[PDB]
Structure 1
Amino acid sequence: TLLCGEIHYFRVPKHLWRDRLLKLKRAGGNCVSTYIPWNWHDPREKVVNFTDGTSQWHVASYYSRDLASFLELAGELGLRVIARPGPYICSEWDSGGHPNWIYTKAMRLRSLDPGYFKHVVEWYNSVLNILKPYVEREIVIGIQVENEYFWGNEKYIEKLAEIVEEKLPGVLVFTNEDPYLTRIPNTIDLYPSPWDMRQFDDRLRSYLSSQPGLFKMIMELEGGWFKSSRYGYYPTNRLSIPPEWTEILLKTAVGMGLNNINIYMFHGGSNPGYYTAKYLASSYDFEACIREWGELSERYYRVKRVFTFLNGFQELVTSLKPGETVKTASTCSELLQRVGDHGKIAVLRNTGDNLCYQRLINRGEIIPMWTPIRVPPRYAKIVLLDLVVEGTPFKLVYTSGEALLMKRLGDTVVMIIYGDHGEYTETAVEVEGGVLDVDIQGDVLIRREGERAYLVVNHTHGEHLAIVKSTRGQNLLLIFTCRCRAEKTWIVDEDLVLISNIYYIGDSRIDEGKVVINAELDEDSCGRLLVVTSREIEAISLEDLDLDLTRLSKYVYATHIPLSMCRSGKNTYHPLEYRLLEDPVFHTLTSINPSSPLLKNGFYENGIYVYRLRLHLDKKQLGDLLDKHLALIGFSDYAVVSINNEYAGSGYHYIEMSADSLREGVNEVTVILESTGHPNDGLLYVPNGIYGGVYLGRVGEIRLYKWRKTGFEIPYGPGFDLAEFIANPEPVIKALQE
């Protein structure tokens, strides 16, 4: 199984790569997605960078092209990698990945055009030579050939995939969202509006039936959404994505049987200056799991519980198939079910804002006897059924609480189970050698009936322990926690689990004596720390303060981080002084042809340009209309205009200045133009600079609102090239034929 966050090394400072990738590993992510943007590495038709070097005023020294170090660091952290090296990446990036010199080379991008595709072969030779050692090391596990070619031409994506299958033998090669592929695997990018499970379930059910025997993945699940200028909103444009929603989509995808999931932006981070799409913010925070500034959001902890379950029960979850044999007793939750070789899962989804109480019928009997299954509002609960705990006498017949984790410590299996405060969960344990005894700590109620112990637990802000003993001397330790302490549980080693209030657990030094971990504490992080391990913990200290220990059982230590340790603080810092300088604006000027894009003149960067136009006017000003405007029309995405050194107007693609300061003879017009980015589709050449022109008067304004809509069908499919269609459109036939 692949459990991914997407974390873009080109949007995260190189110093913070370990800080962000270890936050993903600590969530239970076992793989990193990233793009490898072509224009990040070859900005200027020169040499592919692949280092910490930078040669743009708008890209800070701490952003890096050193993908080889990001791949080695993902290797150090034990993360696998999905490389998305496409010539096109989308991703709200500048030109969606294309370097802005290709617009001089090719009129028909994302195609088998010999103009475009020759330069894509040079890019794939560059990036696949960088990837090869990390692919041979099994760090890079899958290559994604481009984002979202929705329109279908198999020829283009198969040539992309054939270059990869030539340079990188035997890897996974696949497309984001092309419905029309036969041999190349396709993925899905599920971005549904909140509480629209109808579209999410139907897109999953459609997708899971597609391409028999080929790899399934959600290559982009909704981990958040981006923010824009001009039409965007604070959290995201959408406007906020509920953290409850991302978790319901994750648990739904699991319940529908899609094992491989990438959350898209797990961090988001920051756009490096003018490496951003047209109208994007410099924040690419995305409202992600990890916020742009490094904060573990509510979405992080929710996602972390699902990704922890999918590691802890990976053997179960990979053995699953549909089955559809369990029933609900009440229609208050939707049931998504799977059955497997050595266990079963029931995802009970409550899309409502009421609390749901549920029962399941498994073999003509209602399973949880003394408790209902509580299903929280805006929630999906993974109920775990019939699970044979491998190599042991224990069958976890059901748990009404969510299991977070399962682990093996010598004689003992450890399982962590959770519910909300004041939730009653019942867990049934069936022992194939009989129950020898059950020990407990906390509010656990034991009912014993033949080979079964039924464990009814009232969840509270701590751990309740049950230790079911088998006659064979194997043990099952069940640890029952509230939801927020399952959210703040860290497997800091395979033999060290910390159940805690702690905000984050960070880096570790698993020494042969004196183990050390880099905990980060917020004002909630104090209270009990519960440590599960086979190591004989002799003492625990925090920052050379000694902490008190209770050894609850052979594998478990309680200790308390004092409420005096954590601090609440949020300081602000203000200027000593503000100093003003007027820029003279003009360094040196070179001549450009009227209406010519600045990329046709070798200016491949986005950002600020100043035009000087030396416009000629004469007695034809007496032939100008009473409106007397000057209009600057068809320019890239922001300009401030000055006419004969008087400020005249500003705006986005069209400015209609009052022509107050025009004169007979030569008129200087200065246009300080800022190009925010090219758009992040990869099909249209939207030029930077003034691609239009300067115009006089306003004789009229013809509004176009009496449309006839003629129902034309674009012939999308395995033979359809969208770039050929944009260049040579067939609706000319249907315009002639009415």
Structure 2
Amino acid sequence: AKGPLQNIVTWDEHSLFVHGERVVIFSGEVHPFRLPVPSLYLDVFHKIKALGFNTVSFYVDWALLEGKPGRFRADGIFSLEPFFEAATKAGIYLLARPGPYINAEVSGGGFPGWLQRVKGKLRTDAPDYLHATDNYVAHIASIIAKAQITNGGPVILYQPENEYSGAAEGVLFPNKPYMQYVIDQARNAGIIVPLINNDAFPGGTGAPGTGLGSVDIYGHDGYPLGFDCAHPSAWPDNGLPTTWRQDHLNISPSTPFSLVEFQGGAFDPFGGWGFEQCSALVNHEFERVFYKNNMAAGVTIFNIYMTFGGTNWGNLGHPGGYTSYDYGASIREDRRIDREKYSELKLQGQFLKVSPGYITATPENATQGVYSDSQNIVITPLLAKESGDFFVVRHANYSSTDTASYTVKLPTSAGDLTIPQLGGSLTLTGRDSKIHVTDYPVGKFTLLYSTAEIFTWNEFAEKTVLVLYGGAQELHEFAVKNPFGSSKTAKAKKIEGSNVTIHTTSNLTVVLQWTASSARQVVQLGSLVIYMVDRNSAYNYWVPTLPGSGKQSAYGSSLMNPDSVIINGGYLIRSVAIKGNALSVQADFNVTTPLEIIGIPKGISKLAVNGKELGYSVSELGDWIAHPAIEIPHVQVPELTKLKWYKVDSLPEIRSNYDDSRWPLANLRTSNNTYAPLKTPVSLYGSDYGFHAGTLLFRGRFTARTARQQLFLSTQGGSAFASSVWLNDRFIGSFTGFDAASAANSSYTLDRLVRGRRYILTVVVDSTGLDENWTTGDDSMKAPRGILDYALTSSSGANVSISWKLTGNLGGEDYRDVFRGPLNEGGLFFERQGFHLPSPPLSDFTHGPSSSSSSSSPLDGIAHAGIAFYAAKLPLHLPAQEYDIPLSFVFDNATAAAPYRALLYVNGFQYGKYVSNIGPQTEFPVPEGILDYNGDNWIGVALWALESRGAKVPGLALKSKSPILTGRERVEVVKGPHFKKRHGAY
């Protein structure tokens, strides 16, 4: 760490500077590879920009971009260019986090499965590991380098590595040569923006001052609330972080206090609680108490992990999670922004971006009974000589759901005051926290104090507007230094409301008291207009920024205090633009509402909403009240059970005529897997043969020595895997799986054999992904998939040899679907043939009447253990131009039903792994873009019946959410290749 390499993005003890402007970086985490629809990145960026955020943080997943060693590929849905372009179009900057290790609840933590064949320890300077990363970093860091702000792009910060924060016993840590090699790779590829790290906790690793391997800005992470979604109302003792200001001063006082990942939800395992329960844990209450507690410590680079989670499509996830990555985040997996936590987060983002005095105020120790007589609240001051103070108030027991009555005694430029000055008590209701301010600048005006929270303010050409809010029934008071200019006759004017009271002192400080309610109060003081609302009304206000000019026009006039228009109403305001005398608004509506526009730019006299001009009413304050057309239609979608379903056997391997001459031989007598030394005479680890994704199959030949033999089989597929075994066409048994099992020891009897005859065992082993590698020196990502051990013995105890063949996805690292990437397909027969792709060869399938013995529907299923694949055309004709209509596939989980596993495919993309006996996911959202809302789709369901009774899907339906009338940019269908007969398939 030796200072900035450029002068566009710089820093000091208090903040980043971008183009010379101090800024609070308020960022949301988005992972481009979890939303493979390029034209929807702008939708999510619009939703994050509207929170008041200025930045997005993103991972890149190496395993998707270098599935074949030596062949980096970031094209099509894997290109970052549409992601960068959308950031520029939205006016969002980016923190790039390309790893190589990212963790991220993705398969291998980002490491491609061929790292199982690297002997050295991962995330160390073992040269076989280091040099295995070089091609990926050279390519991805040069892509990121071109997108830097120094080249006119959105990238302002780069993170090397990920939570490099401790190691296994005996392993060098921190390994400074390792850390510096990782930095050098990025610098050598042209990264010149500052480097920021993300220590898992405040351990000091890589901080400035630590020499070799140090980054520019020390960052760390925090997930205090934890992940016990089992008990969403429980906030445990000592869960609130109380040491981070002092830890920051101890570790890196020269750089901004940075939380590079702060909890925005929780992951959820197989057999978990579901993301709705996680969103109830990490809810709006969590945000206002815990996020304001980070403001109490002066955070000025603050990223919320996750803000939009997306989906672990195409097997990209790790075994510790399932298909959904909704995360309980403020933006749902289907991109809806109806959770209350979204609107609460917007209040916080909009506050910070108009409050530059927050940056240079000094956070001090938390206090009790100092800034209030009350001991039942804790107050943390951020103090400044003249630029304004901030006071973060919480219950002393941070978990408390009680209501507290209090007053405060705060320092001001007019001396210390007990507030309310006009009588009465403030209220702090359960799991709330507030920021009170003193000497807060509002343009030319100054708030001597305010107990109500600030949503936004701006100086418009004819008035200054300030929007303040409280929770309902809270009494609040604020005071404005003489707002009347040289006038010694001017007075306050009540415009709306009958609750606000106003008292003016001899020096013309105006003191206003009001009790928040659903009825807005509005008072005009000179050219200052204050709108006083309750919190639930403030949730519906928006502050879109007015564009500048040129390529960077969407970044507006500045990052802090930008030129803006204030809009009351709407489910989303995406943007505003001026053209001539017209203000054009892009907006989404999920319910009817008026729109009230506050702060009309000079010279503008026309209004348009989503391209349609409309009139408006003008208020005495010059606000516009408009009533755009909002029709929310009934939507009908096709019944999946009435589609024309086609079926194909996807376990032809067990039929006596099956030829496996094309299958890879499992004949490697040694392995480079140093984490799981071989127990078997040949490797039966998928990754040793190039198979890293999805289900594996093994075929073991033996000659019977006795009529009865005993088979021991140890399989490993990752948490919640399963495995099934046949002897020729005879079902032997399944390990049916559970949340806590990543491997299984099974024992089976192979009876009634003909001595001297050859038999073939077919063993199917699912994989739920490769494990993460969070502890350096513990090569846990190298945990293999397949058969760990076996023993076949005759009835006299003799050992019986087995010779093996195996497969995963056809081609292995020479994977067949370059468009959908290296992990989308597993090894099941239908996948290997490409039968999951659009327009499959229906002559290879069967069709027959549902509920008949010739049924080809997944609703009728199969009457024996085995695996079938079902395909159907799903035409959709929905009004996607005008409406955002989220669609999802829902499986009915019938309590008494034989266990099965299913895979969901939509136009060739795998969009769901359903595990009927483990759960918890039953609803599988699929985005527009992957689905064609005005054309033919192909839907696929694989059904793996684990028990000899067989299985069926009890119910399968397409579900829609309420249509949202939308002003988004149009969604283009992703052009995934259709089926084509594969040469060399088996």
Q: Which residue of 2 aligns with 1:438?
A: 492
Q: Which moved more, 1:228-237 or 1:147-156?
A: 228-237
SS of equivalent to 1:129: helix
Q: Measure the CA separation in 2 of the matches of 1:533 and 1:78.
A: 21
Which position in structure 2 is the counterpart of 1:533? 600
In the alignment, is residue 656 of structure 1 matched against residue 746 of structure 2? yes
RMSD: 2.9
Kindly indicate whether the alpha-carbon contact (under 8 Å) linking 1:86 and 1:145 is maintained by their aligned counterparts in 2.
Answer: yes
**For residue 114 of structure 1, what is the aligned residue in structure 2?**
127
**Secondary structure of the residue that 1:611 maps to in structure 2?**
strand
Alignment partner of 1:381 out of 434, 444, 452: 434
SS of the equivalent of 1:656 reads strand
Q: Is the 8 A contact 1:222 1:246 kept in 2?
A: no
Contact kept, 8 Å, 1:384 with 1:403, in 2: the verdict is no
Relative to structure 1, the CA distance from residue 689 to residue 595 in structure 2 (aligned partners, 3 Å threshold; closer, same or farther) is: farther
| C-alpha deviation, 1:481, in angstroms | 1.9
- Following superposition of structure 1 onto structure 2, how do residues 10-49 of structure 1 map, counting pairs within 5 Å? 10-12=33-35, 13-49=37-73
Closer, same or farther: CA 38–423 of 1 in aligned 2, 3 Å: same
Q: Can you list the C-alpha shifts for 1:123-152, whole angstroms capped at 9, x where unaligned? A: 221112111122123621111111112213
Shift of 1:389: 3.5
Matching residue within 112, 116, 129 for 1:103: 116
Unpaired runs of 5+ residues, structure 1, are 53-63, 470-474, 700-738
The reply on whether 1:8 has 2:8 as its aligned counterpart is no
Show CA shifts across 1:344-364 (max 9, x none): 111111332122222111244
Give the drift of 1:168. Answer: 3.6
Aligned residue for 1:680? 772
1:461 aligns with: 518
What displacement does 1:566 show? 5.5
Unaligned runs of 5+ in 2: 1-23, 167-173, 226-233, 547-562, 654-659, 668-680, 738-742, 797-986
Aligned counterpart in structure 2 of residue 642 of structure 1, from 726, 737, 741: 726
Give 1:162's aligned residue. 184
Change (3 A) 1:536 1:373: farther
Indicate yes or no: 2:320 matched with 1:320: no
Structure 1 residue 187 displacement after superposition: 1.9
Match of 1:730 in 2: none
Distance apart, 1:260 and its partner CA: 1.2
- Give the match for residue 574 of structure 1: 639
Give 1:217's aligned amino acid. S
1:203 to 1:220, Cα distance in 2 relative to 1, 3 A: farther
1:256 to 297, 300, 314: 297
Q: What SS class does the counterpart of residue 522 from structure 1 fall into? A: coil
DSSP 3-state at the match of 2:353: helix
Q: Judging changes above 3 Å, is the alpha-carbon distance between structure 1 residues 600 and 305 closer, same or farther for their aligned structure 2 residues? A: closer
Work out whether residues 244 and 379 of structure 1, in 8 Å CA contact, stay in contact via their aligned partners in 2. Answer: yes
In the aligned structure 1, how far is the partner of 2:652 from the partner of 2:688?
A: 20
Q: 2:375 aligns with which of 309, 331, 338?
A: 331
Q: Which of 84, 93, 96 is residue 83 of structure 1 equivalent to?
A: 96
What secondary structure sits across from 1:477 in the alignment? strand
Cα separation, partners in 2 of 1:235 and 1:400, compared to 1, 3 Å? same
Letter matched to residue 457 of structure 2: M
Change (3 A) 1:584 1:301: same
Q: 1:549 and 2:623 equivalent?
A: no
Cα offset for 1:615?
Answer: 3.0
Equivalences for 1:119-158 in 2 at 5 Å? 119-135=132-148, 136=150, 137=152, 139-151=154-166, 152-158=174-180
Matches within 5 A, 1:294-693: 294-296=335-337, 297-313=339-355, 315-323=356-364, 327-340=371-384, 341-350=386-395, 351=398, 352-363=400-411, 364-370=416-422, 371-390=424-443, 392=444, 394-410=445-461, 412-431=463-482, 433=485, 436-443=490-497, 444-450=500-506, 451-469=508-526, 475-494=527-546, 495-523=563-591, 525-527=592-594, 529-535=596-602, 538=605, 540=607, 546=614, 548-554=616-622, 556-560=623-627, 565=630, 567=632, 573-575=638-640, 576-577=642-643, 578-586=645-653, 588-593=662-667, 595-599=682-686, 601-619=688-706, 621=708, 630-634=712-716, 637-651=721-735, 652=737, 653-659=743-749, 661=751, 663=753, 664=755, 665-681=757-773, 683-684=779-780, 685-693=782-790
**Is this contact kept in 1: 2:310–2:324, CA < 8 A?**
yes
> Which 10-residue stretch deviates more, 426-435 or 146-155?
426-435
Give the distance between the partners of 1:177 and 1:620, measured in 2 at CA.
60
Residues 1:232 and 1:655: Cα distance change in structure 2 (over 3 Å): farther
Distance 1:485 1:237 in 2: 26
Aligned residue identity for 1:79: I
Contact 1:2 1:260 in 2 (8 A): yes
Determine if contact 1:485/1:499 at 8 Å carries over to the other structure.
no
| Post-superposition CA distance 1:649-691 (Å, at most 9, x none) | 2235215254254624433111122212101225321112223
Q: Which moved more, 1:101-110 or 1:544-553?
A: 544-553
Say if 1:245 and 1:71 are closer, same or farther in 2 by CA, change over 3 A: same
Q: Tell me how far apart the structure 2 counterparts of residues 375 and 467 of structure 1 sit (CA, whole Å).
A: 28
CA distance in 2, matches of 1:479, 1:662: 85
Q: In the TM superposition, what is the alpha-carbon distance from 1:298 to its structure 2 partner? A: 1.5
Supply the AA of the counterpart residue of 1:91: A
Cα gap change, 1:453 to 1:308, in 2 (>3 Å): same
SS of residue in 2 equivalent to 1:327: coil
Check conservation: 1:399, 1:427, Cα contact below 8 A.
Answer: yes
Q: Is the 8 A contact 1:68 1:131 kept in 2?
A: no
Distance 1:41 1:571 in 2: 39
Give the letter aligned to residue 64 of structure 2. W
Q: Which residue of 1 aligns with 2:223?
A: 191
2:241 match: 201
Matched residues, percent identical? 21
Deviations 1:630-658 (A, max 9, x none): 43444554322222322222235215254
- Between 98-107 and 658-667, report the one with greater CA deviation: 658-667
TM-score w.r.t. length of structure 2: 0.64
1:242 aligns with 283
Given the alignment, which residue of 272, 282, 285 partners 2:313?
A: 272
Contact 1:496–1:533 (8 Å) recurs in 2: no
SS of aligned partner of 1:607? coil
Over 3 Å counting, the alpha-carbon distance change for 1:197 and 1:365 in structure 2 is farther
Q: Deviations over 1:298-319 (max 9, x none)?
A: 2211111111111121x11111
TM-score (norm 1): 0.84
Conserved? CA contact 2:581–2:604, under 8 Å: no
Report the Cα offset of residue 486 of structure 1.
1.8
- Bigger shift: residues 367-376 or 344-353: 367-376
Q: Is the 8 A contact 1:635 1:691 kept in 2?
A: no
1:520-547: per-residue Cα shift (whole Å, max 9, x none)? 2223x42563433334554556675855
| AA of the residue aligned to 1:334 | V
Deviations 1:263-317 (A, max 9, x none): 011000011311111242111111111100011122211111111111121x111
